[PDB]
Symmetry: D2
C-alpha cells in the first residue's frame, strides 16, 4: 500500500474452460508422480489455486507455430539450417521492458544475419524470453544467510527473508510478463527493426566501436556487399519471409508448465503453450524424474543439457525416451562440457547417439561449463566444431546468454573487460563478436 | 500473495518540454465519466504501467494511418467490430478466436461486395470501460462501468471503483493482443477457410437461402484467385488492429510512449486507434484535448444533436494538418433520423477540404436487427446522394449469425 | 536476289545410334498426305533448317508436359485454338495480336467457370499444312494444302508443290513466335484488360444480354483479387504454347534437335506440342512412328470410325511409360454421334491405367454454331456419366465473337 | 540450284498494312533528304520493293519493351544502374545458330552477375544481336582487289565479285535472321539458362581453367557466398525478375531501319522495332546527316560513338539534337578514344555536356579506339573510370565485342594469346576476365 511502496493486484477468479482429455491427463498424472528436483516449496493448495487461474488464460504460443518450429528444427538436424538460441540468463519482471526486449531482439537478428552469411544456410532464431524466470540452486543458503533466489517465478531477488519466500502468485505474475513480452516480440519481428537494411549500420557501429573492430571489418564488408547485391537483384523486404523469433525457457517449474498445457492434434496431443520449445537443465534431467517424463508427454521440440558427467549410454537413453518416433529435430542435445573437456568428452557421446539412427540437433552451450572469460567461451565452440568436423556430423547450433546492453559481466572481448540476476551474459559487443567468430568456424 | 489472491508489485527520461506542457493542459481540462478512485492510488497504478511493454508499437499506428488514408480517399472500407464490452471472465482463447474468425469472415464478404480492401479494426485488447447515463442502476447499485473500473457482480463491494483494475486491464489487453498477433499469422487467417464458414452460415441461418447466391459468388471468386496461381504465401498476412473507447484517462495517459515525420510525438500504445464517445466529446474537455496530443488515428461519435458547425470544429481541432485518415466521424443517429440529420453535417465538413472517414455506427442510436440494417442503408443513401464515400461500419458483435448477415447486406449495399 | 524476288542461301554431330535407328525406321514407314516434291530439293531445304534457331526450346516442352499432366489428373483445363490455317499473307502483328487477345480472353472466362488453371495452346507458328480428301479441287486444280506446300491462288503454277515453302514456313513461324513471346510479356497479357474486352463482347453481341451475368461475376472476381492485394507483378507471366498438326514430315524431321530424365532425346522444336490428324494416324504409319520418337506431348484426332481397341493401341504406343499429359485423345465425332461413340472408347482407355487428356474438337465432325456447342455439351455429358475429366477443347477461331460465346457456354458447362 | 549448292527462296509479295501517319512520314522524309554516308549502292526500285515487304512483317521488338528499357536507362543516367552492352562485332547468317546465340547469352548473363556484385546496383543487359549485320568500310577496295564486305545485310563475306554485289534481298534475309535470333533470346532468358544458380559452376570453371584464375578466385568466392546468402534468406528463382536481354545494333542501313518503323503513343510516335536501342557510328554521325536526323525522329533510346576527333562543342550539339526534351538515358554518349588518349580527351567533353543540365549515359567502348591487346582494352576502361571519379560523374557502362566461343582474336588475357567476319572479339575467358576487372573498378 501507500506506506511500503507496493500495490496489491487482485487475481480474478474466473470460470474454468473444459478439462483436458482424461486419457492425456492420465498420462500426465503418471509422469508427474515421478520425483521432481528443484521444485518450489509452496503449499499444494496455493499451487492448485494458481494453476487453475492459468488453465483458462490465452496461451503464449499456438500449436501451428510449434509445428512450424519442428519443421525448421528438422532442417537443422539434417545439416540444412543452423540454430541460434540466446537471451537473458534470467529474465526479471523489473527488466521486462520495451528497451530491454528490443535490445535482445536486435542482438539475435544481428547475430543471425552474420551466421546466415557464414553458414550459407538459414538460421532458426530461438530467444530465451517470455518465460525464463526460474533457476535451480545448488546452495541451500546463499552468502547473505538467506534462502536462495530461484528466479522471479518463485521468489524475489531482494536480499530479505519475506521476498525470498516461495509465492505461487508469482506463477500468475510470470504469465502476465511472458504474454506482454511475447506480444512485443511478435510486434517487433513484423516491424522495421526486422529489416535486413538496418544490418549495414549495426555492423558498421560494431566495427567502428570495437577495439578488435579492424579484425571483423572484412567479414562486415562482405555481408554489406552481399545485402547490396540482394537488393541490386531486385529483392525488397516485401519479398522476404517475415522474421520469426521463437520463445524458449528451461522447463523447471512444473506447476507453471502443466497449467500452460493445451490440447491440439492428427491424434490429440498436449502442447506446452508457455513457449515454442523448452529444455531440461543439468540438475533436473534425471532419467526416471518428472522433468524428462513431462518432456515425453508434450508435443513441443525439447532440449536436454549434457554436462561433463554425461556418458554415451545415458545420452542414448534420452534419445529413446524423448525421440521414440524418430522425428528429426524433436530432440536437441546441448553440449556444456567446458573448453578444456569438450574435445575429449563429446566425441564418444556423438558416436553412440549417431549409431541409434536417430537425428538429434547437436547444439553447443559454451557458457555453463566455463564470471566467464570470453576466450574460453570461444574455445569451447571451436572444440565443438572440431568434434563434429572429425566425426562428419552437423555442428547444429549455439545456446548463448546475451543482452543488447553494454553491461560488464563477461571478461575479455575487444573491450578487454577486467546487472544479471544470475550468471554473466555477453554484452551487445561480445555477443556480436562471437557471431563473427562462429561465422568464420562455419566457413573454414 | 497467493493467500490474499493478490500479485504484489514494488513501485520503488522526461517528455520534450512542449509535449509535457500540452499533455498537462489537456489533463487539467474537465473530464466526464472518470472513475472516482483516489489520485494517490491511481498514481501508483500508473507508475506500474509506465514501464510495461506496450500493447502496440508506433510503426503499426503509422501503417494503420496509411490504410485509413485509403479509406478516406474512397479506395478502401473500414470494418470495426467486436465485443460491446470485453470482460476478464471471457478473455479466453475460444472467445478471442471466435471474434477474430467473425471479423475475418465479415471482411472477406465486404471485400467482395466493395471490390476494394477492408481495413479490420477489432474492439479488443482494452474495451474494458464504458460511460453510464446514471451513477445508480435499476438494482440501486453504483453502475457497472466495465472491468477496468469495477465488477459486474450485483453487490456494492464489487461496484466500488478499484484502480488495481488499470493493471488487470493491461494484463488482459496484452494477453489478448499476443493471441490476436498469433492467430492472424496462423492457419485461421487463410482465405481457404471462408468456403466452410459461409457454407455453415448459409446452411444454419433461418434466412440462409437469401445469402446462398452471394456466398457462391465469393466461393467462385476465391477459387478463381487460386486458379490464377495465388497461394496464401503470396498474400499480405492478415492485419487486425486493436481499438477501444479512450475513456479512462488514467489508463490512456499511463500507456503514452514517445516515438519519432522526424519529430518526437506521443503515441497511445494501449491500442492502434481509439474513439471518443458521445458522453465524453465535450469540445473544451480533456478527452478531445488528449486526442489532439496523441499521434494515433482517432474517431469521434456523432449523435442526433450534432450540428454541422460543431462537426467542423471537431475536424479542425483533430485534423489540424489535413492528414486523410487521421479522423473518423462516426454517425450514430438512429434509422429514423440518419437520412435527415447526416446530410448537412457531411456537406459542411466536405466543404472544409479536410478528408475524414465517414463511418456508420448503427447500434447506439437504435435492438431490432431491421432498424440496425435500415440505419446503415440510410447512411449509404446519404453518401450516394452527396457523392461522398460511405467509409465503414462500427458494430458490436448482434450474435455471430446476425453480424455475418449484416456483412452480406452491407456487401449488397456496396454493390448497388 | 531482289531482281528474281528470291533470297539466295548457300547450302555448302551425329544422333545417338539408337535414335538414328528409330528415326530412320519411323520415316521408312508409309506416310499419307505428303507433298510430291523431289527428294533432292527437299534434302537441300532440310539442310537449311538443320542449323536455324529453333521455334521452341526443350525446357518449355518439359514445362508444358508438367502442366498437361495437371490437365490429365483433372486439376487444369486445356484451351487449344487459333487459325484453321495460318497463311503467310495474314502473318502480321494485327492478326497475331487478335488471336493472342482471343485466347487470353477465352482462357480467363474458362478459368472462372472451371475454378482451375487453363493451359493456353495456340494453333500458331507453324499451322501451314493441311491434308485433303481429293488431290483435285472443285475448280479442277491440284488442291491447296497450306502455304508450307503450295499457294492458295487458283492457278496451276501456284498449286505446284514448292519445297522452298519449308523455309518460308520456318521464317513465318519464327517471326510469329517472337511476337507471341513479346505480347505474352507485354501489357496485352494483364488481367485488367478483360473488363473492357468482356464489356465490348456483351455490348456488341446479339446474344450479349445472355452473358452479361457471367461477365459481371468475372469482373467482380478480378476486382476481388486486386482488392486482396494481387497485382500483375505477383502473377505468373502469361504462357501461350505453340502447336500445329505434324503433317509435313520433311519440316518436322528438319526441326528435330537433341536434348537431355538425364538421357538424350529428340525434341521437335518446330512447336511445343503437335497432333496427328484423322487422315495420317495409320497405326503402322510414319506419323504415329515419328510421334513415338519425339519427346513432345502429342495429340491424336479420333473420328467416328474409332474403336475402343484401336484407341487403346494408340495410348499404349504413344504413352508407353505411363506419363500423364504425354498423350491427348481429341474426340471429333459430330454432335449427333459423340454421346453414343465416345463412352465405350473412354471406358476401355481408362481401364488401361494410362491417363490421357480427353479433349473435344467440335469442328471437324460437324458449320452451324449450335451443332458445335452441342458436340461440346455431349462430350461433357459423356465424362460426367463416367466420372472422367472433360479435359479441354480444340477450336478453330468461329469469328472472334462466336469463339468468345463458346468460351461463355463451356464455362457454364464446367460449372454445371 | 542443284549444280551450284544454293537454294533460291521466293519472297512472298503480300498485302500492305495501312501506311504510317502522313505527319510522321513528312518528318521522316525531311530527315532522309539529308545526306547519308556508307549506304549500300543498290538501285532505288529494288530497295523500295524490299522495304515494302518489311513494312508488313511482325516486329522484332514491341513499344512497351522500349518504354521499359528507357525507364532502366534513366536509372543508369542517374548513377543507380550500370549498362552492359556486348556481343558479336558482326553477326553472320552462317553463325546465327542456337549454340552461338546461347554462348553470347551465357557470356552476357555471367558478366552481368559479376558487375552487379561489384557495382552493388542493377545491370541493364543490351546484346549486340538480332540485327548487327551492317558495317561501314573506310577502304573502297579490300586487300584481295574486291569491293569491301559490308556485312550480311548488304553483301557476302565470300571473296568473289558476285557475292560482294549489294543485294537488298539481304534486307529480308536479315529480318528473318533477326526475328529467329530474337525468338531464341526471349526463350533462353525465360529458360533455366537465366538461373543465378548456374553462376557458381560458370565462375568455378573460369577460375579453374584461367591461368590468371587464382587472381579472380577471391571475388568469385565472394559472389558464390553472396548467392548462397540470398538463397539462405529464402530467395528462389520464382521470387526474382525474369532476366531481360535487350537487342541493339548500329543503325547503319537506313532502308532497313525505315521499313522497320511502326506507330505507337501519349502522342503518336515512330518506334524503330528492328531493335530496342540503336547507336550511330563514328563514320555516320554527321550532325547534319540522315543518321542523326533519323535518330531524332524515333522514340528508341539512342547512342552516339565519340572518337578522338570529338570536340566538347559537337558533343553538346548531339545532346541538343537527340535529347531536346531532357529525358535522362534517352541519349548515350559512347567514348572510344584509345587507352593513351581517353584520360586527356574525355574530361573536357564530359564537363561541357554536364553543364547543359541534360543527363546522358557515359558509356566506355574500349575496343574501337585500340588485332587488339587485352591490356590496352582494360587500361581504356581504367582511364574512363578515372575521368568520371575526378569529375564526380557516373561511369555508366561498357560497350564490348565478345563471344562465348574460345576463339583466338584478341592478344593477351590469362591465355597469353600471341572466326570474326570483322574486328577481333574477346573470347569467353577474356570477356569474363574484363567483367572481374571492371567489377574491381566499380568497387575501388
Ligand atoms: Cl519483484
Ligand atoms: Cl507418444
Ligand atoms: Cl574446462
Ligand atoms: Cl496526477
Ligand atoms: Cl502537432
Ligand atoms: Cl431513430
Ligand atoms: Cl532422305
Ligand atoms: Cl523412349
Ligand atoms: Cl453428327
Ligand atoms: Cl551467305
Ligand atoms: Cl519530338
Ligand atoms: Cl591510344
Ligand atoms: Mn545461465
Ligand atoms: Mn456499446
Ligand atoms: Mn481445320
Ligand atoms: Mn567492331
Amino acid at each position: 500500500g501507500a506506506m511500503n511502496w507496493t500495490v496489491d493486484i487482485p487475481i480474478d477468479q474466473l470460470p474454468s474452460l473444459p478439462p483436458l482429455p482424461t486419457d492425456l491427463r492420465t498420462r500426465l498424472d503418471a509422469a508427474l508422480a515421478k520425483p521432481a528436483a528443484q521444485q518450489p516449496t509452496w503449499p499444494a493448495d496455493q499451487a492448485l489455486a494458481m494453476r487453475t487461474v492459468l488453465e483458462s488464460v490465452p496461451p503464449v504460443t499456438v500449436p501451428s507455430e510449434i509445428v512450424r518450429l519442428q519443421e525448421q528444427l528438422a532442417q537443422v538436424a539434417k545439416g540444412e539450417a543452423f540454430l541460434l538460441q540466446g537471451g537473458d540468463c534470467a529474465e526479471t519482471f523489473m527488466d521486462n521492458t520495451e528497451p530491454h526486449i528490443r535490445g535482445n531482439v536486435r542482438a539475435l537478428l544481428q547475430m543471425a544475419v552474420v551466421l546466415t552469411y557464414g553458414a550459407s544456410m538459414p538460421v532458426v532464431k530461438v530467444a530465451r524470453i517470455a518465460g525464463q524466470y526460474a533457476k535451480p540452486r545448488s546452495a541451500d543458503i546463499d552468502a547473505l544467510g538467506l534462502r536462495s533466489y530461484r528466479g522471479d517465478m518463485i521468489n524475489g531477488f531482494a536480499p530479505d527473508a519475506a521476498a525470498r519466500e516461495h509465492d505461487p502468485s508469482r506463477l500468475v505474475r510470470a504469465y502476465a510478463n511472458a504474454s506482454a513480452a511475447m506480444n512485443l516480440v511478435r510486434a517487433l519481428t513484423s516491424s522495421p527493426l526486422a529489416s535486413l537494411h538496418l544490418v549495414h549500420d549495426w555492423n558498421r557501429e560494431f566495427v567502428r566501436t570495437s577495439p578488435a573492430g579492424a579484425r571483423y571489418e572484412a567479414l562486415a564488408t562482405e555481408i554489406d556487399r552481399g545485402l547490396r547485391f540482394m537488393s541490386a537483384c531486385g529483392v525488397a523486404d516485401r519479398n522476404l519471409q517475415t522474421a520469426e523469433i521463437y520463445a524458449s525457457h528451461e522447463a523447471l517449474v512444473l506447476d507453471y508448465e502443466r497449467a500452460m498445457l493445451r490440447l491440439s492434434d492428427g491424434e490429440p496431443q498436449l502442447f506446452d503453450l508457455s513457449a515454442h520449445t523448452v529444455w531440461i537443465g543439468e540438475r533436473t534431467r534425471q532419467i526416471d524424474g518428472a522433468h524428462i517424463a513431462f518432456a515425453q508427454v508434450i508435443a513441443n521440440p525439447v532440449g536436454v543439457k549434457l554436462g561433463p558427467n554425461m556418458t554415451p549410454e545415458l545420452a542414448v537413453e534420452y534419445v529413446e525416451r524423448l525421440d521414440p518416433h524418430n522425428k528429426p529435430g524433436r530432440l536437441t542435445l546441448v553440449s556444456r562440457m567446458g573448453n578444456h573437456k569438450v574435445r575429449d568428452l563429446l566425441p564418444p557421446i556423438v558416436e553412440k547417439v549417431q549409431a541409434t539412427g536417430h537425428q538429434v540437433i547437436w547444439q553447443c552451450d559454451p557458457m555453463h561449463g566455463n564470471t566467464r572469460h570470453f576466450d574460453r567461451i570461444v574455445d569451447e565452440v571451436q572444440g565443438f566444431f572440431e568434434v563434429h568436423r572429425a566425426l562428419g556430423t552437423h555442428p547444429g547450433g549455439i545456446h548463448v546468454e546475451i543482452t543488447g546492453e553494454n553491461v560488464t559481466e563477461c571478461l575479455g572481448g575487444a573491450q578487454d573487460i577486467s546487472e544479471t540476476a544470475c550468471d554473466p551474459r555477453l554484452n551487445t559487443q561480445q555477443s556480436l563478436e562471437l557471431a563473427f567468430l562462429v561465422a568464420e568456424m562455419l566457413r573454414d
